[PDB]
């Protein structure tokens, strides 16, 4: 399991627990998965910015 975890890829909800981040209870009746996957863009609309670069 340790070997699998070292390179295995988890979802955003599982990642966010490192910083004690959890989905608000008021969102439990809505489809937040689509908003997470296809509606929050991590790339500037105009193009690529020098600052917005994830190592």
């Amino acid at each position: 399991l340790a070997g699998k975890i070292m390179l295995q890829d988890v979802n955003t909800v599982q990642l966010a627990r490192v910083v004690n981040l959890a989905v608000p209870d008021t969102w439990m009746s809505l489809d937040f998965d689509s908003m997470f996957k296809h509606h929050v863009k991590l790339l500037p609309k105009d193009g690529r910015h020098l600052n917005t670069d994830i190592p």
């Binding site: 609309k45 105009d46 193009g47 690529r48 910015h49 020098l50 670069d53």
Partner: protein
């Protein structure tokens, strides 16, 4: 001013940004051709004059 009030041509600078948004690049490179050209062009409103 006369040309502005009778000409049907409209200058919409968002055309340039839309095309540049689909350029294929790598995020580990120091230089970005798409970002640099947009910086030099700097789409503004006073291009009419």
């Amino acid at each position: 001013v006369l040309l502005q009030r009778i000409s049907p041509l409209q200058i919409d600078p968002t055309i340039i940004s839309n095309t540049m948004s689909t350029v294929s690049e790598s995020t580990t490179q120091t230089l970005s051709p798409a970002s640099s050209i947009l910086g030099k062009l700097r789409p503004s409103n006073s291009d009419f004059s």
